[PDB]
């Protein structure tokens, strides 16, 4: 019995357009987009997206309808079929330790949805800086496959998976390959030593591999755990297969695996909604004010004008693009135009 029509001052958020995008990032990428100064409708969002599960943490779904927030950030990535259980709220799995960490001390909501396998592509890009500096290309995997990391490493700016070839010349047992390292980085630490009768025996660091090494304190590649809102700094490099410029072989990168994401001929994608600031800002919901939106030919709030009256379906052509109310010389209202249905009524 309440007719409430008003023109919005802010545009729509259009979250479904970014969620249903044809490019789906891997858990190593987990692209992020921040939504602010816009209006959203949770019912339409859940209807236009094929929802499988939706739960929230430190926040209830009842208070979402009709609340205003400062900004909303959304993170999305595809889910491997193997590590789907690692996405729970609190778990020491490979995903939450190497790819994406879910914060428990914030008001967040987790969403599991699916996307048709047609015209969808998966982007497997390594965001590591020092990995691509020494000759890392692409994973070269089949379609509908996502890449995840189980061991992530971090190094300083002074790092080079390469030894000085002048020193390696005097080696006979376990002679590592060497090449020319770019300026500003120290070479791989190798030393010449004799055990009992072997004169030329050269010992180096990071043996056999940085994942399973005997001396973690002497290898510059050190294991690290990703934090809140951080990617993996880089993957481990087998220094025995690297090395002109120091170019490591593509088979010398360890600490990554892959698995498909096809379930019931559909691809599963994880989404995390983080709400920054409640009861403030201009990012509000339109669920409460757009409940019915149907005028039966009654209290009305039409563009700020309040009152009561009746309506009728008439043909009016005197309304311009900016005009919505009809007034007489006495100052009363005797008609209006509906900007939702393009129909004019008489009061």
């Amino acid at each position: 019995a309440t007719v409430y029509r008003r023109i919005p001052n802010l545009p729509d958020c259009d979250i479904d357009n970014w969620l249903n995008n044809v490019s789906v990032p891997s858990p190593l990428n987990w692209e992020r987009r921040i939504f602010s100064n816009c209006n959203f409708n949770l019912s339409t969002l859940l209807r236009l997206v094929h929802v499988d599960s939706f739960s929230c943490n430190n926040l209830d779904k009842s208070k979402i309808f009709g609340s205003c927030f400062n900004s909303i950030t959304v993170d999305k990535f595809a889910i491997p079929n193997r590590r789907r259980d690692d996405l729970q709220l609190g778990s020491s799995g490979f995903l939450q330790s190497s790819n994406y960490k879910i914060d428990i001390s914030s008001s967040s909501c987790q969403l599991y949805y699916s996307l048709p396998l047609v015209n969808v592509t998966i982007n497997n890009f390594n965001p590591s800086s020092w990995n691509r500096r020494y000759g890392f290309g692409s994973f070269n995997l089949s379609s509908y496959d996502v890449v995840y990391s189980d061991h992530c490493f971090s190094v300083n700016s002074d790092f080079c998976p390469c030894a000085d070839p002048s020193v390696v010349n005097s080696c006979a047992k376990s002679k590592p390959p060497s090449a020319i390292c770019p300026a500003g980085t120290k070479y791989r630490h190798c030393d010449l030593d004799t055990t009992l009768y072997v004169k030329n025996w050269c010992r180096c660091s990071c043996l056999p591999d940085p994942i399973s090494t005997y001396s973690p304190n002497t290898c510059p590649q050190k294991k690290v755990v990703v934090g809140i809102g951080e990617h993996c700094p880089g993957l481990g490099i087998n220094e025995e297969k690297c090395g002109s410029s120091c170019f490591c072989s593509p088979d010398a990168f360890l600490g990554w695996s892959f698995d498909s994401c096809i379930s019931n001929n559909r691809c599963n994608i994880f989404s995390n909604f983080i709400f920054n600031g409640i009861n403030s800002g201009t990012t509000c919901s339109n669920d409460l004010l757009y409940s019915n939106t149907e005028i039966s030919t009654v209290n009305y709030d039409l563009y700020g004008i309040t009152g009561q009256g009746i309506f009728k379906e008439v043909s009016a052509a005197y309304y311009n693009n900016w005009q919505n109310l009809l007034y007489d010389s006495n100052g009363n209202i005797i008609g209006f135009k509906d900007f939702l249905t393009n129909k004019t009524y008489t009061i």
Binding site: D193, T195, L196, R203, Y214, S215, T218
Partner: protein
């Protein structure tokens, strides 16, 4: 000893320092008050004539006597099947001309009996008078440290020693380093705790430096030479 601490005058009375020309060279351990166990690489042909040997006991800080207050070694017996190239079967025995009556801070350690069933990563202790950080001087005080025992299969890896650990030798220490024995800790007691009694299981023979990664310590396995010691002690009388 690197990474250890100076041992207080407690009860570890199985370390004997051998002095030739009035300077400390190699250590040792006592099992009976007539014999001392030590390495054979320090008793080579130039070190013959056991008359030029003396032994000290109950002395932590290495300044308590000079050309006196010591025990003269009568005869020295070395392992016959000893090779100086690969350092295999490095065990020597020395007999004292004095009965060496037992008193405070003087008590030997029993030889390991066959069938100890030791754990792979067992806990052990080392002691000696060696350097402090690297290629230093002789430690004035007696220091010790705690080490772990590593298996022979992992010690014979291509990145550690490349199949140079014979069955007569065992590896002990840490693969990360910072805890090992340097030059001067010859002989040396490698003891462990089991059944409320200490057992001597090792004997410092050689090694590649000290406190370095991928270079653990090599100790002689007295389990194989237990019968030879008994045979020599029986043939002595």
């Amino acid at each position: 000893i690197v990474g250890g601490e100076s041992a207080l005058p407690g009860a570890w009375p199985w370390q004997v320092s051998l002095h030739v020309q009035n300077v400390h060279v190699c250590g040792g351990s006592i099992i009976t008050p007539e014999w001392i166990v030590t390495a054979a690489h320090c008793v080579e042909k130039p070190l013959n004539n056991p008359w030029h040997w003396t032994a000290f006991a109950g002395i932590l800080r290495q300044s308590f006597m000079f050309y006196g207050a010591g025990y003269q070694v009568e005869k020295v017996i070395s392992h016959p099947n000893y090779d100086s190239k690969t350092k295999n079967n490095d065990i020597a025995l020395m007999k004292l001309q004095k009965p060496l009556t037992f008193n405070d801070l003087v008590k030997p350690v029993c030889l390991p009996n066959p069938g100890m069933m030791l754990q792979p990563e067992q806990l052990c202790w080392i002691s000696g008078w060696g350097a402090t950080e690297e290629k230093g001087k002789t430690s004035e005080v007696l220091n010790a440290a705690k080490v772990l025992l590593i298996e022979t299969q992992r010690c014979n890896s291509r990145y550690v020693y490349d199949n140079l650990i014979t069955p007569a030798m065992i590896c002990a220490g840490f693969l990360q380093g910072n805890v090992d024995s340097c030059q001067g800790d010859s002989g040396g007691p490698l003891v462990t705790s089991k059944n409320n009694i200490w057992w001597l299981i090792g004997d410092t023979s050689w090694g590649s430096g000290c406190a370095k990664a991928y270079r653990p310590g090599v100790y002689g396995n007295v389990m194989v030479f237990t019968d030879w010691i008994y045979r020599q002690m029986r043939a002595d009388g």
